[model samples]
Target chain A: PLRDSVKQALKNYFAQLNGQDVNDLYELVLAEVEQALLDMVMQYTRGNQTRAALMMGINRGTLRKKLKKYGMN
Target chain B: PLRDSVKQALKNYFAQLNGQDVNDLYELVLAEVEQALLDMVMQYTRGNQTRAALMMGINRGTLRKKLKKYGMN
Candidate 1:
């Protein structure tokens, strides 16, 4: 499960931090997962924006914005 | 670590979709992970919002807004 893996990752993350503070970890994780996810889905749909949006359950415009943000398009 | 787990989770998630579409999966995953991360940090800080924000590497105000959004505050 993603939840389990996330839990494990957090454990590993904090364990290595040694109390040192890091910034934007939330955004960092989100972007990493989102990028990979969108990349695969885009490939799964052969770069068809409309189909990708449907599979992602987001608006086509929204998908385009994310692609733009990630420089994937 | 988080990245690896996220990739695994996505694999599992798509495998079970079975052609049934889900809405807001991106938001869903983000919310799930974000909530868990914040909950742990807040606990680590003993509910001290400022300290939690620091550990989370986000602004206190941003943390508060997220807490409000998730009703953690």
Candidate 2:
């Protein structure tokens, strides 16, 4: 639904880190990055495995496998 | 597409989070929790609607419904 919004959200997320020291921001960023990625991929795909995989540029089988591991799909 | 903004960016992210304390970490932590939850539910389901509902303590229809809200499949 929000392809650019997703990218912008990520950019804003990282931009918020700009003034801070890298070492201090490591863990928070790690957490945020993972969440951001997961959220964006999910959104871009519109929740459809086939389409989401296409948007994500990954194989559908591969995406399904990871979704299984995360106990999500 | 901005190829460089993908998952590999995690390390740089955490680097910027080191100085913040847990109290200051609440918002971020909660965000992570929600993200983790979405991840877990979808992963558990293998992206399936029925299974994810069981783990999430919700109805299968409800789960599928939320997936729609979240733009997930």
**DockQ scores of the candidates:** 0.51, 0.03
In candidate 1, which residue pairs get closer than 3 Å at backbone N, Cα or C atoms, i.e. clash?
A: none
Q: Cα RMSDs of all predictions?
A: 2.4, 18.0
Please write out the lDDT profile of model 2 over residues A4-68, one tens digit for every residue.
33345544544564554332222343344445555555754468777656544557897677677
Regions more than 4 Å wrong, model 1: none
lDDT of 1: 0.77
Clashes of 1: 0
lDDT of each: 0.77, 0.48
Specify the highest-DockQ model's number: 1
Q: Compute the lDDT for candidate 2.
A: 0.48
